[PDB]
Amino acid sequence: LERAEERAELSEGKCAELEEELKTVTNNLKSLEAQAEKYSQKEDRYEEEIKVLSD
Amino acid sequence: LERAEERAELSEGKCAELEEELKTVTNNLKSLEAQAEKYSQKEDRYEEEIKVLSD
Lengths: 55, 55
Fold this sequence. Notes:
Oligomer: part of a larger assembly
Entry title: Structure of human cardiac thin filament in the calcium bound state
PDB class: contractile protein/actin binding protein
Keywords: Troponin, Tropomyosin, Actin, Thin filement, Muscle, CONTRACTILE PROTEIN-ACTIN BINDING PROTEIN complex
Number of helices of chain A: 1
Organism of A, B: Homo sapiens
Chains A, B: Tropomyosin alpha-1 chain
Number of strands of chain A: 0
């Protein structure tokens, strides 16, 4: 039980660590979703600067 | 013990679920990062072209 509880604690430790990493990565995912979209928009703002400059 | 073990299984189960959620968001982050980076690279290509056309 102590070892199983220890495993629960170690696994919970990992669970929490992964959760923290999950959230960090997910938060990065979200900032990156925002960046991938802002960047796709920049891909267009810059493409537009090229089109405008081309004109 | 069944509970300590259940908790070992539950916390291990959940930490494994988080490993999968983490890998999923990590891979989505890598995808969005790669996407954002492909866009940042396009932004740079345009910036290079913006500088070329601006100049």
